[PDB]
Amino acid sequence: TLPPAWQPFLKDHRISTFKNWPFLEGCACTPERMAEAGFIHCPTENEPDLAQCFFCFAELEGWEPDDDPIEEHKKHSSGCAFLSVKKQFEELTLGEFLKLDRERAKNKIAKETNNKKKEFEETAKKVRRAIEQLAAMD
């Protein structure tokens, strides 16, 4: 009875996204530990082990059994505030929670911005190339 947009804030929800995750008992990066670090399982045909931080939207693959997810998160997304959250969900005040959800909405946008830029820059290289090639014959 919590809205789905907010479910990823819940460890138990995040764990639940790991269904056919290969690293189970014996491994350091189990679902419990991936979830405690912020990750959601976002697998694809092409990258079966893709994990995404629900908060900062960093995406990491190439997991190995000894990998500590908290350590990998710090290594590859040093700025993610979720890593600073020491309190349990239910111990957060609504003010804190709302402060956190604004930050996530800003992170999401930074991420979409950063993608749109890269796609644009790629498109621009192709057009530039095309016009150079045409100018090259005259």
Partner: peptide
């Protein structure tokens, strides 16, 4: 583990 590229 490393970043998508």
């Amino acid at each position: 583990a490393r970043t998508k590229q």
